[PDB]
Design a protein around this ligand. Structure first.
Ligand SMILES: Nc1c(S(=O)(=O)O)cc(Nc2ccc(Nc3nc(Cl)nc(Nc4ccccc4S(=O)(=O)O)n3)c(S(=O)(=O)O)c2)c2c1C(=O)c1ccccc1C2=O
Ligand SMILES: N[C@@H](CCC(=O)N[C@@H](CS)C(=O)NCC(=O)O)C(=O)O
Ligand SMILES: N[C@@H](CCC(=O)N[C@@H](CS)C(=O)NCC(=O)O)C(=O)O
Ligand SMILES: [Ca+2]
Lengths: 198, 198
């Protein structure tokens, strides 16, 4: 397949896909559109949202659907049907919390206040559940790295921007992030990707 | 296998799993909890949410991850990997929207503002996109029913509680709901299930 990923010039919801491409050493066109392109790009999307990934002329959409598609029949999937279910479940838990944030809120002061409230009053209960879940194991699921680990590194990277001390009580979750960042293909992508806030 | 679904006494986020069990003819315990029993069950769950599904003593969480686990290798999944991705992407498009509603909000003026806004402005855009996406086809993905058609029926049932004219410009979306509801195992479940608002 020829692959064309369309998104904004940010990590955002496309980053999980870009990591999977890096990890599997698969070539693709990382198409990054400008704001001013958006009305034309959007007219061609099935539900008005990006990322989309075109595969031999056919459009796929929804970031986590696409990530799941790309990892099928790979070592990133989950080694059993039960583990595959767990991979999905941790991914959706993270995704649910990410979607609590008002990313598109226009009023700066209110956006801020809600980010701070979410990060102070809500995030600590999820960090604790994730840490307890991981226990002393190496990876979130199974005995090998999966895309759920990628998603945790990706999500916590953005959260750390807004809450530097997020993981101060959670060394185990920091070690996991480090393990993902050290995978040679992933480290290489992290080093080379365009530097964006989000 | 020995299956026990735990959720509130409502369709909500469990209903997709209930349709899949019905359609596959799989017996399970449909455990509906009462509000006063939740805090104590809540504290025993790795991530403090329902639904959960117990499978032979093992606990799964996250309603779409579990729905996916249950339909793997059935005819409710798509017929190729690319179609499975389309099924996933429709399900998440639907979920993204349902999850926009402030189901939990306590401030009644703020909840009622947001509902009316979503239903008046956003929802018609979604209907239009979904109707274009379905075109003249029988089912949303491929040439046979998948759990994405089930999710459309479940989601639209709740939306229609709040906006009965939602589908007045989209006969084909109504017909797609009827197709789902006419499948004998689904029809029998709908007829027999507990009558809740949601
Ligand atoms: N769901 C989102 C969304 S959402 O809009 O779909 O709710 C948004 C979102 N990020 C995300 C962050 C910013 C913007 N866009 C956006 N919007 C405004 Cl009102 N201002 C700016 N300004 C802006 C522009 C460029 C750079 C930085 C900034 S700034 O936010 O720091 O001020 N950008 C947008 S946009 O696509 O809706 O336009 C998505 C994320 C996610 C994620 O789920 C997510 C998951 C894991 C890691 C990261 C993310 C994530 O970043
Ligand atoms: N759950 C979806 C979220 C899709 C989404 O809301 N994408 C944003 C970019 S992060 C978008 O296309 N926003 C532009 C808009 O809604 O107009 C996914 O993972 O792809
Ligand atoms: N995306 C999740 C959402 C899980 C969720 O937030 N469930 C709610 C009820 S719909 C819940 O457990 N709320 C009670 C609580 O969290 O205290 C899923 O599909 O399972
Ligand atoms: Ca979701």
């Amino acid at each position: 397949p020829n692959y064309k990923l369309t998104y904004f010039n940010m990590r955002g919801r496309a980053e999980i896909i870009r990591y999977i491409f890096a990890y599997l050493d698969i070539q693709y066109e990382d198409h990054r559109i400008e704001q001013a392109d958006w009305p034309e790009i959007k007219s061609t999307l099935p539900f008005g949202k990006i990322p989309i990934l075109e595969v031999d002329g056919l459009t796929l959409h929804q970031s986590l659907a696409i990530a799941r598609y790309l990892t099928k029949n790979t070592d990133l999937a989950g080694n059993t049907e039960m583990e595959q279910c767990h991979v999905d479940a941790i991914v959706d838990t993270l995704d649910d919390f990410m979607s609590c944030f008002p990313w598109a809120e226009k009023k700066q002061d209110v956006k801020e206040q809600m980010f701070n409230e979410l990060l102070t009053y809500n995030a600590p209960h999820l960090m604790q559940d994730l840490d307890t879940y991981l226990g002393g194991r190496e990876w979130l699921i199974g005995m090998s790295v999966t895309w759920a680990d990628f998603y945790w590194e990706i999500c916590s990277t953005t959260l750390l921007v807004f809450k530097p001390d997020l993981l101060d009580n959670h060394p185990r979750l920091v070690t996991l992030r480090k393990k993902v960042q050290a995978i040679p293909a992933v480290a290489n992508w992290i080093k080379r990707r365009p530097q964006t806030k989000l």
